[PDB]
Amino acid sequence: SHHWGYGKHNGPEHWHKDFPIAKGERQSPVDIDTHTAKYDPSLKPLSVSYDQATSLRILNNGHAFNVEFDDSQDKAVLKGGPLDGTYRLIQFHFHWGSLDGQGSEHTVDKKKYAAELHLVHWNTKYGDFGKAVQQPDGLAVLGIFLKVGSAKPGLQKVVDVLDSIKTKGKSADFTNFDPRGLLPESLDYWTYPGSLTTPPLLECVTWIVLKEPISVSSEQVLKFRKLNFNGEGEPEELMVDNWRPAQPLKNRQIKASFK
Ligand SMILES: NS(=O)(=O)c1ccc(C(=O)N2CCNC[C@H]2Cc2ccccc2)cc1
Numbered sequence: 001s002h003h004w005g006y007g008k009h010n011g012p013e014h015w016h017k018d019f020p021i022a023k024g025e026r027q028s029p030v031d032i033d034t035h036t037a038k039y040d041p042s043l044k045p046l047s048v049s050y051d052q053a054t055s056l057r058i059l060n061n062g063h064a065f066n067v068e069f070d071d072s073q074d075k076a077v078l079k080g081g082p083l084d085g086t087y088r089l090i091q092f093h094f095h096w097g098s099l100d101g102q103g104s105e106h107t108v109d110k111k112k113y114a115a116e117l118h119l120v121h122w123n124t125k126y127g128d129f130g131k132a133v134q135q136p137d138g139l140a141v142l143g144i145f146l147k148v149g150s151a152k153p154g155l156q157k158v159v160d161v162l163d164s165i166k167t168k169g170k171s172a173d174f175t176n177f178d179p180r181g182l183l184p185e186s187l188d189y190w191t192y193p194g195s196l197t198t199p200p201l202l203e204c205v206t207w208i209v210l211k212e213p214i215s216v217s218s219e220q221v222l223k224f225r226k227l228n229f230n231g232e233g234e235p236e237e238l239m240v241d242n243w244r245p246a247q248p249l250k251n252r253q254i255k256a257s258f259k
């Protein structure tokens with residue numbers, strides 16, 4: 001069953017055949033032209049409240065790995081910035097490259113980073129994640145670039161469990177992980193209305209992309225690249241280059257929180 005992925009035969013240039021919204025008016029990711037983005041002095045500071053976050057599990061889903069959270073209560077929430085109301089953290093995942101020069105989905109003045117972290121949150125006025133993805137303001141995804149340099153100490157607990165979820169469908173218990181250890185110092189951001197960056201490509205996301213990248217070590221990102229897209233006992237296909245390239249901005253303005 002020829003399903004979507006990141007290969008020559010099923011990659012992003014093919015997705016529009018099953019998911020015609022792939023060619024829609026508010027697709028993600030996009031290039032962030034830093035000179036064209038306008039400072040919006042009316043944006044509020046972001047509020048990232050992750051002190052009571054409850055991580056549960058880590059899953060290799062065949063496209064990335066997800067660190068999943070208990071989102072049955074307001075434990076880890078994103079508020080403020082461009083957002084109206086309360087968005088609950090459900091999971092985070094990454095997109096990364098085969099080489100340090102590529103891997104991010106968003107670009108900054110056409111610069112590709114080695115990877116991009118997505119902290120996915122849903123608007124609690126819609127009651128569940130599945131209902132939120134049907135709404136134009138359903139999700140808020142906090143995007144953080146990764147560059148290769150110094151290790152990120154707060155990432156290592158993730159890196160060290162990846163050996164236990166090498167292949168598609170594998171999960172492992174992943175309790176007491178603190179996603180505050182993945183944040184940069186500054187919460188300066190760009191924001192624009194967009195989409196999921198994988199099928200079904202629904203146009204339900206407020207994107208909030210932090211200016212300041214986090215640094216990870218070469219050894220940390222090499223461990224991402226040992227994961228597999230394939231199931232156990234299938235021919236090995238390394239989980240690399242699981243990123244969608246930049247899509248046309250169309251009738252959108254990227255707003256900056258900062259001068
Ligand atoms: N890269 S992204 O943050 O836009 C993002 C976030 C979540 C999802 C997601 O998990 N989806 C999309 C919404 N329906 C459920 C599920 C389906 C899915 C499962 C695994 C991989 C990709 C998509 C996909 C992309």
Ligand SMILES: [Zn+2]
Pocket residue numbers: 093094095118197
């Ligand atoms: Zn993502």
